[PDB]
Amino acid sequence: KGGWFGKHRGQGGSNPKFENIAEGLRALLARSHVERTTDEGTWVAGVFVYGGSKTSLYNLRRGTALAIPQCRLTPLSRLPFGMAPGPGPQPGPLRESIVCYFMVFLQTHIFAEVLKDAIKDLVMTKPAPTCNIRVTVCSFDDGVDLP
Amino acid sequence: KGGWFGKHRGQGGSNPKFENIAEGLRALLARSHVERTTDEGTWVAGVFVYGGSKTSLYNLRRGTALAIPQCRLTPLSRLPFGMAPGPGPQPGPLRESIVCYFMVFLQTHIFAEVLKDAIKDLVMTKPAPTCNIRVTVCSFDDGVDLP
Amino acid sequence: KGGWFGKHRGQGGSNPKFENIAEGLRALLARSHVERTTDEGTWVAGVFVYGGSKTSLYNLRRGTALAIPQCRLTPLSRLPFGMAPGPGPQPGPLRESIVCYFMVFLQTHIFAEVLKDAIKDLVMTKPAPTCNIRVTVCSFDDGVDLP
Amino acid sequence: KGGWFGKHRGQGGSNPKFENIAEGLRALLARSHVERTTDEGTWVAGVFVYGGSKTSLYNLRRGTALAIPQCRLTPLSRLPFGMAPGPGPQPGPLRESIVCYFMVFLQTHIFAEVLKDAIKDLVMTKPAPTCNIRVTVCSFDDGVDLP
DNA sequence: ACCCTAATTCGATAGCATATGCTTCCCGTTGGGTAACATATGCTATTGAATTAGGGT
DNA sequence: CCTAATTCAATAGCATATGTTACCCAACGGGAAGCATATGCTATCGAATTAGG
């Protein structure tokens, strides 16, 4: 099983698994009734989603793609190693670890938080590896010019 | 031309090209007597570097890695589309553009502003398409826990 | 497949279904680091749980049974009818509907709202009837003297 | 003596016995003209009545029901045990007792505190074991949507 | 000032190794609905033992 | 230092409620196979600025 299915990349569809991960989201983000698009449309906020595993982090993005068509989604990449313990030479800035990450772009400082707090709670119940997905809020000082 | 040169993802060495990029950044940053590492070792601020062209981004990433042994770098990744002008359907959240980005994790917020400038400045000196690269500072409200 | 199992009322045990439903409660509960018992041991608080279905309420009482040993739990009963629509005589104050409900007794008003918000979040991500379960906070003005 | 009498749960009717209780209430609260209803028909407050004995609680539920067609009454059901005196092993949460309780749902927060005092004095005048019934006022921060 | 002709710069490129996106089968987990035995309550009318009223002294 | 009347709780008993388990099985959601295609990496090549008797 598996192979090519005629829809390339950045062009993912809708599957019963995701739309439940999405519905589970677009119920937790309900609790707060905040704005999602600004009159200006500039991307000044964002949510940074990482950890767990690549399968978990993917399905979560795939659901978030459905729960929030008012946002824009990077594909999953990887993270640089941290700061190594002990006082030796540190790992080389460019170095790659196996943990993935993706980014959620948004137009709103406020509803960034609403998503960060919903993802933290959607994840928190599930059994591993979903429990290990982590979320922080990032806000871009100068806005980001998505094409 | 081309082939396997034994160096895997994130283990790129330095060659007179990339340390030449990195020596430009170091002269902009040897004016700046700021501290680059905290003791809690937490990664709170980011420089989001994007646009330009895959390769000059790739080169700039590669110089930044030699100038700044205190940063951490993602790999290159793609941006998704912004809003669409005029009318019609909007882009899908997931839909991805030809435009690239990487990120530069850092331990202090004072050094992100500094490094956003050096990069904005250093790239304005180099010929096109390099100089169309854009830089915006992140702040992670909770911090990024790099592995 | 049915029958007697030597477990009277208010004397139920533990099995891997309730233990994971209580796992997912603890998680939503850890978010606030608030105290759960005082030195008077007065029962001054409460969480009134109801709706959804009898089975789904039971699995949630059974779960909160494990997740919170500092509380005490009533068995399930049924709710009386509300206000009939229109201006005819209302339903008899004694006549009961099929909704069930249970209660949780607690020693601090603060931890009561942590469990209100913990149950409300736990459930809304789940598919029916678990998400029709509803939660309000109680506070007994003179305390309740459990035997 | 005994047996089936056609009447299912919550469908219990008037007889000269209970209307002697209901008219004791209707004389303690008669010359307190406060308003028992609202137009929103929201069930914000309760009066928790418990202790006493299984049957003399049963009569008072049945009295309270004729006196007040503005209230709603649960059926009877049991209380869990309280704190055992001394750091000996504690009763389980689900632990249940020989003591019973019912609740009185109400639409106003004033009439709640009226009906607590009417009951607390309607019980003052009847012989033991009745006089040991404990009445406490209850409030629902989010209210109870009765079916 | 002019200007055609050297070095000089980086970006663009080829090409191996290996990423992710996309989906379809897989399958352990999560979690509600049910059967079936001991035992709760709701319901009535009848029965029992206190507290209460009566009227002799 | 008083025996008839009174007041309610306690009762028997049918029909039915949940407490409890173990069994069933629909779904929720992570992991892997497998094609197109993206990057990391290097050294080499090419097309733009910058330069001198």
Residues A77 and C25: their CA atoms lie apart, in Å, by 32
- Shortest distance, CA C1 to any CA of chain D (angstroms): 24
Question: Rounded to whole angstroms, what are the CA distances from A100 to A49, A64, A75, B8, B78?
Answer: 9, 16, 10, 17, 14
* Amino acid identity for residue C120 in this structure: K
Task: Give the residue among A19, A13, A52 at the shortest CA–CA distance from A130.
Answer: A52
In the set C43, C48, C58, C81, the catalytic residue is C58
The residue that minimises its CA distance to C1' of E31 is C17
CA angle C84, C88, C92 (to 5 degrees): 60
Any A CB within 8 A of B78 CB: yes
Residues 6+ apart with CB under 8 A from D12: C94, D62, D65
Task: Give the residue among B33, B115, B128 at the shortest CA–CA distance from B73.
Answer: B115
Q: What are the tokens at D58?
A: 């049963």
Are D41 and C82 within 8 A, CB to CB? yes
CA angle A135, A139, A143 (to 5 degrees): 140
A112 phi and psi angles, rounded to 5 deg:
-55, -55
Binding residue per annotation — D116?
Answer: no
Q: Which residues pair with B15 in a beta bridge?
A: none
Any C CB within 8 A of D58 CB: no
* Amino acid identity for residue C51 in this structure: G
* Amino acid identity for residue C127 in this structure: P
Are D93 and C65 within 8 A, CB to CB? yes
**Determination technique for this PDB entry?**
X-ray
Binding residue per annotation — C101?
Answer: no
* Interface test mutation site (partner C, options D42, D61, D146, max chain C beta carbons within 10 A): D146
Residues B126 and B23: their CA atoms lie apart, in Å, by 13
* Amino acid identity for residue B49 in this structure: V
Residues C116 and C137: their CA atoms lie apart, in Å, by 6
Element at C113 (helix H, strand E): helix C109-124
What is the SS3 assignment for B15? coil
Residues A55 and B96: their CA atoms lie apart, in Å, by 20
Helices (H), strands (E): how many in chain C?
Answer: 3, 5
Task: Give the residue among C118, C141, C119, C144 at the shortest CA–CA distance from C132.
Answer: C119
Q: Which residues pair with B137 in a beta bridge?
A: B47
List, as one string, the DSSP characters of C77-111.
Answer: EEEEP---SSSSPPPPTT-EEEEEEEEEEES-HHH
Please state the separation of Cα D26 from the chain's center in Å. 15
Any A CB within 8 A of C27 CB: yes
* Amino acid identity for residue D20 in this structure: N
Q: Count other C-beta atoms under 10 Å from residue D14's C-beta.
A: 11
D110 phi and psi angles, rounded to 5 deg:
-85, -55
C64 phi and psi angles, rounded to 5 deg:
-65, -20
B58 is catalytic: yes
| C129 cis-preceded (ω within 30 degrees of 0) | yes
Question: Rounded to whole angstroms, what are the CA distances from B66 to B9, B22, D7?
Answer: 16, 6, 87
Burial of D95 per CB tally in 10 Å (0-12, 13-18, 19+):
buried
Task: Give the residue among C137, C134, C75 at the shortest CA–CA distance from C106.
Answer: C137
- The CA-based diameter of chain D, rounded to the nearest angstrom, is 51
Task: Give the residue among A41, A42, A73, A64 at the shortest CA–CA distance from A144.
Answer: A42
- Fold classification of D1-147 (topology level): Alpha-Beta Plaits (3.30.70)
Q: Which residues pair with B134 in a beta bridge?
A: B50
Cβ-count burial A110-139 (b if 16+ within 10 Å, e if not): ebbbbbbbbbbbbbbbbeeebbebbbbbbb
Residues C45 and C137: their CA atoms lie apart, in Å, by 8
Residues A53 and A45: their CA atoms lie apart, in Å, by 24
Residues 6+ apart with CB under 8 A from D54: D76, D100
Subunits with 3+ Cβ pairs within 8 Å of C are: A, D
Q: What are the tokens at C35?
A: 């105290």
Q: Count other C-beta atoms under 10 Å from residue B57's C-beta.
A: 21
Residue A131: DSSP 8-state: G
Are C143 and C42 within 8 A, CB to CB? yes
Residues 6+ apart with CB under 8 A from A13: A7
Q: Count other C-beta atoms under 10 Å from residue B131's C-beta.
A: 15
Residues 6+ apart with CB under 8 A from B15: none
Q: What are the tokens at D103?
A: 């609740």
Are A118 and A111 within 8 A, CB to CB? no
Please state the three-class secondary structure of chain D as a single string: CCCCCCCCCCCCCCCCCHHHHHHHHHHHCCCCCCCCCCCCCCEEEEEEEEECCHHHHHHHHHHHHHHCCCCEECCCEECCCCCCCCCCCCCCCCCCCCCEEEEEEECCHHHHHHHHHHHHHHCCCCCCCHHHEEEEEEEEEEEECCC
Residues C146 and D50: their CA atoms lie apart, in Å, by 9
Element at B21 (helix H, strand E): helix B18-29
What is the SS3 assignment for C23? helix
* Interface test mutation site (partner A, options C29, C60, C125, C126, max chain A beta carbons within 10 A): C125
Are B143 and B43 within 8 A, CB to CB? yes
Question: Half-sphere exposure of B57 toward its Cβ, with a 13 Å CA cutoff?
Answer: 24
- In chain B, the DSSP E strands lie at 43-51, 72-73, 77-80, 96-106, 133-144
Q: What does this entry list as its resolution, in Å?
A: 3.0
What is the SS3 assignment for C59? helix
3-state percent helix, strand, coil for chain A, nearest multiple of 5: 30, 25, 40
- In A52-109, the DSSP E strands lie at 72-73, 77-80, 96-106
Question: Rounded to whole angstroms, what are the CA distances from A141 to A45, B23, B80, B91, B138?
Answer: 9, 26, 19, 24, 6
